[PDB]
Amino acid sequence: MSHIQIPPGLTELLQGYTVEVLRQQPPDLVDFAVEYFTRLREARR
Amino acid sequence: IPPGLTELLQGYTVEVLRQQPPDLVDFAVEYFTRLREAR
């Protein structure tokens, strides 16, 4: 009771976003997140 | 480290752990869009 599930690919997803933030230095991190993850999903097809 | 990066990562990550979404990137799009709209 009260186990936590860690899905596969969570760490990798976070890393990909974080590397882009630290290198590109976008001014708005939330705006960048929407754009980054939206493009990721579009490219997955 | 830029202002608020840790907070953004923690917020998303803890919600993944709490909610168990079926797809991580779908959830990311949804979660960050909500945040953008709330501001």
Binding site: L14, T18 | T13, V14, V16, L17
Partner: peptide, 19 residues
Amino acid sequence: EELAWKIAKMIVSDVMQQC
């Protein structure tokens, strides 16, 4: 949270250390 919070913190810290 409680355990979810603790584990999230652990995961985020690991990401920040690697990046």
